[PDB]
Every structure is written in structure tokens, then in C-alpha cells.
Design a protein around this motif. Structure first.
Motif, PDB file in Angstrom:
ATOM      1  N   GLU A 100       0.837  -1.188   0.000  1.00 14.34           N
ATOM      2  CA  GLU A 100       0.000   0.000   0.000  1.00 14.34           C
ATOM      3  C   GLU A 100       0.875   1.242   0.000  1.00 14.34           C
ATOM      4  O   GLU A 100       2.051   1.182   0.376  1.00 14.34           O
ATOM      5  CB  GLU A 100      -0.932   0.010   1.222  1.00 14.34           C
ATOM      6  CG  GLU A 100      -1.936  -1.132   1.245  1.00 14.34           C
ATOM      7  CD  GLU A 100      -2.930  -1.066   0.100  1.00 14.34           C
ATOM      8  OE1 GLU A 100      -3.174   0.045  -0.418  1.00 14.34           O
ATOM      9  OE2 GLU A 100      -3.468  -2.127  -0.283  1.00 14.34           O
ATOM     10  N   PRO A 101       0.339   2.384  -0.430  1.00 11.81           N
ATOM     11  CA  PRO A 101       1.140   3.614  -0.428  1.00 11.81           C
ATOM     12  C   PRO A 101       1.406   4.120   0.980  1.00 11.81           C
ATOM     13  O   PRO A 101       0.619   3.905   1.905  1.00 11.81           O
ATOM     14  CB  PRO A 101       0.274   4.602  -1.219  1.00 11.81           C
ATOM     15  CG  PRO A 101      -1.115   4.088  -1.066  1.00 11.81           C
ATOM     16  CD  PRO A 101      -0.984   2.593  -1.045  1.00 11.81           C
ATOM     17  N   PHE A 102       2.540   4.801   1.131  1.00  6.93           N
ATOM     18  CA  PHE A 102       2.938   5.374   2.409  1.00  6.93           C
ATOM     19  C   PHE A 102       3.862   6.558   2.144  1.00  6.93           C
ATOM     20  O   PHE A 102       4.229   6.842   1.001  1.00  6.93           O
ATOM     21  CB  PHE A 102       3.590   4.320   3.313  1.00  6.93           C
ATOM     22  CG  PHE A 102       4.709   3.556   2.662  1.00  6.93           C
ATOM     23  CD1 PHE A 102       4.445   2.474   1.837  1.00  6.93           C
ATOM     24  CD2 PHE A 102       6.028   3.905   2.893  1.00  6.93           C
ATOM     25  CE1 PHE A 102       5.472   1.767   1.243  1.00  6.93           C
ATOM     26  CE2 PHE A 102       7.061   3.198   2.305  1.00  6.93           C
ATOM     27  CZ  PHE A 102       6.783   2.129   1.478  1.00  6.93           C
ATOM     28  N   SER A 103       4.239   7.250   3.218  1.00  2.00           N
ATOM     29  CA  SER A 103       4.927   8.526   3.105  1.00  2.00           C
ATOM     30  C   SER A 103       6.420   8.333   2.837  1.00  2.00           C
ATOM     31  O   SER A 103       6.950   7.218   2.839  1.00  2.00           O
ATOM     32  CB  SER A 103       4.722   9.354   4.373  1.00  2.00           C
ATOM     33  OG  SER A 103       5.250   8.689   5.508  1.00  2.00           O
ATOM     34  N   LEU A 158      11.501  -4.107  -3.075  1.00  2.00           N
ATOM     35  CA  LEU A 158      12.009  -4.210  -4.438  1.00  2.00           C
ATOM     36  C   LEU A 158      10.896  -4.207  -5.477  1.00  2.00           C
ATOM     37  O   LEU A 158      11.181  -4.023  -6.665  1.00  2.00           O
ATOM     38  CB  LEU A 158      12.858  -5.474  -4.586  1.00  2.00           C
ATOM     39  CG  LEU A 158      14.149  -5.502  -3.766  1.00  2.00           C
ATOM     40  CD1 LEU A 158      14.889  -6.814  -3.966  1.00  2.00           C
ATOM     41  CD2 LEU A 158      15.037  -4.323  -4.128  1.00  2.00           C
ATOM     42  N   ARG A 159       9.644  -4.406  -5.061  1.00  2.00           N
ATOM     43  CA  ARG A 159       8.488  -4.345  -5.945  1.00  2.00           C
ATOM     44  C   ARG A 159       7.739  -3.023  -5.819  1.00  2.00           C
ATOM     45  O   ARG A 159       6.536  -2.965  -6.092  1.00  2.00           O
ATOM     46  CB  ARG A 159       7.546  -5.516  -5.661  1.00  2.00           C
ATOM     47  CG  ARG A 159       8.145  -6.879  -5.957  1.00  2.00           C
ATOM     48  CD  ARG A 159       7.136  -8.005  -5.775  1.00  2.00           C
ATOM     49  NE  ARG A 159       7.314  -8.712  -4.510  1.00  2.00           N
ATOM     50  CZ  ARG A 159       6.500  -8.602  -3.466  1.00  2.00           C
ATOM     51  NH1 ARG A 159       5.436  -7.814  -3.531  1.00  2.00           N
ATOM     52  NH2 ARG A 159       6.744  -9.286  -2.356  1.00  2.00           N
ATOM     53  N   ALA A 160       8.424  -1.959  -5.414  1.00  2.00           N
ATOM     54  CA  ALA A 160       7.783  -0.688  -5.115  1.00  2.00           C
ATOM     55  C   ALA A 160       8.093   0.352  -6.184  1.00  2.00           C
ATOM     56  O   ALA A 160       9.060   0.236  -6.943  1.00  2.00           O
ATOM     57  CB  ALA A 160       8.222  -0.165  -3.744  1.00  2.00           C
ATOM     58  N   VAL A 161       7.243   1.379  -6.231  1.00  2.00           N
ATOM     59  CA  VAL A 161       7.426   2.531  -7.100  1.00  2.00           C
ATOM     60  C   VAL A 161       7.245   3.791  -6.264  1.00  2.00           C
ATOM     61  O   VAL A 161       6.700   3.762  -5.159  1.00  2.00           O
ATOM     62  CB  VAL A 161       6.434   2.537  -8.278  1.00  2.00           C
ATOM     63  N   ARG A 186       1.433  -4.905  -5.384  1.00  2.00           N
ATOM     64  CA  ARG A 186       0.943  -6.215  -4.970  1.00  2.00           C
ATOM     65  C   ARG A 186       1.651  -7.329  -5.730  1.00  2.00           C
ATOM     66  O   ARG A 186       1.924  -8.396  -5.168  1.00  2.00           O
ATOM     67  CB  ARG A 186      -0.572  -6.281  -5.161  1.00  2.00           C
ATOM     68  CG  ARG A 186      -1.318  -5.294  -4.273  1.00  2.00           C
ATOM     69  CD  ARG A 186      -2.768  -5.108  -4.685  1.00  2.00           C
ATOM     70  NE  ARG A 186      -3.448  -4.163  -3.802  1.00  2.00           N
ATOM     71  CZ  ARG A 186      -4.688  -3.722  -3.984  1.00  2.00           C
ATOM     72  NH1 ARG A 186      -5.397  -4.136  -5.024  1.00  2.00           N
ATOM     73  NH2 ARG A 186      -5.220  -2.863  -3.125  1.00  2.00           N
ATOM     74  N   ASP A 187       1.957  -7.098  -7.003  1.00  2.00           N
ATOM     75  CA  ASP A 187       2.830  -7.980  -7.768  1.00  2.00           C
ATOM     76  C   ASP A 187       3.385  -7.184  -8.940  1.00  2.00           C
ATOM     77  O   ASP A 187       2.897  -6.100  -9.267  1.00  2.00           O
ATOM     78  CB  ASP A 187       2.101  -9.240  -8.242  1.00  2.00           C
ATOM     79  CG  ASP A 187       3.043 -10.413  -8.450  1.00  2.00           C
ATOM     80  OD1 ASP A 187       4.249 -10.175  -8.676  1.00  2.00           O
ATOM     81  OD2 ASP A 187       2.581 -11.571  -8.381  1.00  2.00           O
TER      82      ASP A 187
END
Length: 450
Positions: free
Chosen positions: A2-5, A57-60, A71-72
Motif C-alpha cells: 500500500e502507499p505510504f509517506s 524491491l516491488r515498489a514505485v 501487490r505484484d
């Protein structure tokens, strides 16, 4: 997932992508290239394991000032280019072009992957593996942790590692709750008491005004120090009851005071340490960049190691009040002294000691090229360990520096480290080059007249 700061520097990382500010408009990026004997296909499959293992490592990075783990993700695969049958002139052309294509490329916000791995096939069983990543993704301690899990699944693709019980999103939820009052107010009281006489950043020699530069273009100077010198320097730090980071920041300040003609200068130290918030904190991937500001005093007829002791006591005083981030001090320094929208602390030192127990970013192959781009710095001296060997890398906006001056500052920094190993103290800095001969004939004005 989920998004976060963002952290204070992740905020500064994204703010550094605005070309309206001097030496800004780029994303901070880290680049490394190695010549390996390993299988690219096995490294590509071990990479799919580390992507699913570490969720960060799966983040943007999102344009909302936020960051989100996906999520994937689409499947990643390392592409290898065959230079096997090319003349040595043609294989060097393809390698240098890809270097420019990788360092110049910037990952879009909320696009896809924040990293890239590409390979060349120099020989049928010899490869040039290269890995780059936006600094918003992770820290140097994470890029080595990735390499540790990469080489584990390279040799053992089925030796499943235990799962993680703590990720970078949980650290950011604690990050915002950690920034409140009490110790923060006490830290602010400490920084505001030192501000009325806080020294400025050293007025280092520049070739051009940063106001007419805009987007910076980066080059670097790198020297890998022999392990025998790094051990003797560590023993010298132990004999003087100081941390080696205080030795390096003082040697860094010795060169800057010499070239800036300063009696007191302010350095911008990059500290990591994350925050003591969980047990599995040092075992996951995430962004660990921070900031602190050093109260220095080169005004001294004393030896070098006593300058270091005052450096260390000051370094600890600022570390004991790091709840008030150094970027918050920069905003306080900017308002009173009327600094305007200018680079306030562009003289940056980065302390990345304890590279790793074995540095899995070497177990793959030999280090051939080092590069990094970093917004809003005149020069960033990063010192990082590498399995007993010390790497000194100066990332600088060359659209600001004379090449001979930057090479001299880089050489003097290394020469002072040698004297610390050879004698335990340092000699004052001298300059010859294309400089002494000019002033020697400039004052050759004697005439024979009684």
C-alpha cells in the motif's frame, strides 16, 4: 503493498528532481559495473527470488509525495548483449554507450521498476553485469543485502530463506510517529542554541556560478585503498580513541579549508543507522538516507588527531540530537542569515563504513566502473568499506569545477590518509602543479640598484 509517506531525504530526493533549483532536476541514481564469471541466467532466476522476497524491491515512487509497494510485478529478466565476435574497438563502443544510456536514464514516478540490470557477453563465459537503481528505492546497505540474497539463490536456488516479518512500509509508519515532541523539542533546543554562531559551508573554489547551471552533469573520481592501509588507519583511529569517520571528516575538512581559505567550515554529513525501531531492521530493503551538520574549527595550531577529538565530540553532540533533522536546521539557517533559494550545505560527506561482512557486491566479479548522480551537491565525498578495502569516491557537479582543482583536492585527501598511516599525523598542504612556477617567476623582480 500500500502507499505510504517519504522520509525527510526521500522528500528531498523527489524535490531534487525540480530543475528550477540550482544543480537540481535529476533523480539521485547509483551505478555499478562488474566483470563476472557467473551465469547470467542463474543470476536472473535468483533475481526473481529476491524480488518476491523483499517487497520494497516491488515498489514505485508516486507523484503524490508517497511511495507504494506493488501487490505484484511483471517478471524481470536480465538481458545479455553478445560482444564475443567483435573487435576490441567495437566491443568498447557498445560498453561505453550503455554506460551513458544507463546513467542518463531516469525512472518515471509511478511507472514500473525503479532499477535496471543489463549484461554484456565479453567472452562466451565472461560477462559485464551492471546494476543501477534510483536512490528513492533503497540504500547502499540494501543494495548489498540484495546481493547477499542474490548469491545465496545463485548457488542454492532451492534453499528457501526464512520470510521477513517487517518491511519498509512498517518503518515509515513508525517514522511519522517518531517525529513528534519531547526529545524532538530538546533536539531543536540544542540545534537552535548552536545556530547563532554556526559556521558556513566552506566557500570552495568554483569554476562557474551554480545559478547559471540548472541541470547538473556528474563525473566522479574513485580510489580503492589497499586493505593493509585501511587496517592501519583503523588501528590509528583506535589508538586515538576516535571513530574513523571523524578522521575522514577531518581530512575532508583539511582539504576544504585549504581550498576555501576558511578558518571555520560546515560539513553536511550523510548518516544512515535508520532508526532503532524493530529487530529485523538491518535485514530488509529500504531507503536509509538522512542528514546532520558538523560544527568544525580548523583554526588550530594543534596536531591532526586533536582536531579529530573535537570533531568527534561535536559529531556525537549532533548525533545525540538527530531527532531534529539536519534539513530542519538548514531551514532555520536559511531564514535568518538570508540565504535565499541557494544551496546552503552543498559540501557533503557520506559515511558508509562497514560495507558488509563480505560485500556480496564483489563475490560476483571485479569492480570496473563506479558512478553516481546526486541532486543539490557541489561535491559528495562518500567513503565506503569493501571487504577490508576502502573505496573513496568523489561525486561532483563538474559544471562547477576546474578539472585540475578537483583532481588536486582528491589527491590531497588521499595523501593525507597516507600520512595518517605512515606517521600518525599530517603535514600541511602544499601546491605545485601549474601554480607554483607562476608565482615563483611572478616575484622574480629583484634588480641591482643601490
Amino acid at each position: 503493498s500500500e502507499p505510504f509517506s517519504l522520509t525527510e531525504v526521500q522528500t528531498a530526493y523527489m524535490l531534487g528532481r525540480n530543475p528550477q533549483f540550482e544543480l537540481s532536476g535529476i533523480s539521485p541514481q547509483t551505478y555499478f559495473e562488474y566483470e563476472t564469471e557467473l551465469d547470467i541466467a542463474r543470476l536472473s532466476r535468483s533475481f526473481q527470488k529476491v524480488i518476491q522476497r523483499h517487497p520494497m524491491l516491488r515498489a514505485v515512487i508516486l507523484p503524490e509525495g508517497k511511495q507504494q509497494i506493488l501487490r505484484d510485478v511483471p517478471e524481470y529478466e536480465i538481458e545479455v548483449e553478445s560482444l564475443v565476435s567483435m573487435p576490441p574497438e567495437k566491443q568498447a563502443a557498445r560498453l561505453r554507450e550503455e554506460r551513458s544510456r544507463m546513467i542518463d536514464h531516469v525512472f518515471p514516478l509511478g511507472q514500473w521498476p525503479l532499477f535496471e540490470l543489463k549484461a554484456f557477453q565479453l567472452q562466451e563465459h565472461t560477462y559485464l553485469l551492471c546494476f543501477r537503481y534510483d536512490a528513492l528505492l533503497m540504500d547502499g546497505a540494501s543494495m548489498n543485502l540484495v546481493g547477499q540474497d542474490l548469491m545465496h539463490y545463485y548457488h542454492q536456488p532451492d534453499a528457501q530463506l526464512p520470510p521477513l516479518s517487517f518491511t519498509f512500509q512498517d518503518y515509515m509508519h513508525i517514522y511519522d510517529d517518531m517525529k513528534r515532541g519531547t526529545e524532538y523539542e530538546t533536539a531543536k533546543a540544542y540545534w537552535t542554541n548552536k545556530l547563532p554562531d554556526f559556521p558556513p559551508a566552506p566557500s570552495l573554489l568554483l569554476a562557474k556560478d551554480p545559478a547559471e547551471i540548472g541541470t547538473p552533469n556528474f563525473q566522479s573520481l574513485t580510489t580503492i585503498i589497499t586493505k593493509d592501509k585501511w587496517l592501519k588507519l583503523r588501528r590509528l583511529a583506535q589508538d586515538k580513541q576516535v571513530t574513523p569517520s571523524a578522521l575522514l571528516c577531518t581530512v575532508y575538512g583539511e582539504v576544504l579549508a585549504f581550498w576555501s581559505n576558511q578558518r571555520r567550515l560546515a560539513i553536511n554529513l550523510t548518516v544512515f543507522n535508520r532508526y532503532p525501531v524493530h529487530d529485523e531492521v538491518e535485514q530488509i530493503v529500504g531507503d536509509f538516507t538522512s542528514l546532520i551538520l558538523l560544527d568544525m574549527d580548523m583554526d588550530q595550531k594543534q596536531p591532526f588527531f586533536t582536531k579529530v577529538e573535537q570533531t568527534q565530540s561535536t559529531l556525537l553532540d549532533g548525533l545525540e540530537h538527530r531527532h531534529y533533522d539536519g534539513v530542519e536546521f538548514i531551514r532555520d539557517y536559511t531564514r535568518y542569515h538570508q540565504m535565499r533559494p541557494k544551496a546552503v550545505m552543498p559540501i557533503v560527506f557520506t559515511s558508509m563504513l562497514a560495507g558488509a561482512g563480505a560485500f556480496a557486491w564483489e563475490e560476483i566479479g571485479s569492480l570496473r566502473h563506479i558512478h553516481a548522480r546526486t541532486p543539490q551537491v557541489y561535491l559528495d565525498n562518500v567513503v565506503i568499506e569493501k571487504n577490508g578495502e576502502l573505496l573513496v569516491s568523489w561525486n561532483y557537479v563538474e559544471e562547477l569545477f576546474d578539472a585540475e582543482v578537483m583532481e588536486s583536492m582528491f589527491t590531497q585527501f588521499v595523501e593525507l590518509l597516507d600520512q595518517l598511516v605512515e606517521q600518525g599525523d599530517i603535514n600541511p598542504l602544499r601546491i605545485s602543479q601549474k601554480d607554483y612556477a607562476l608565482i615563483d617567476q611572478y616575484n622574480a623582480t629583484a634588480e641591482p640598484i643601490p
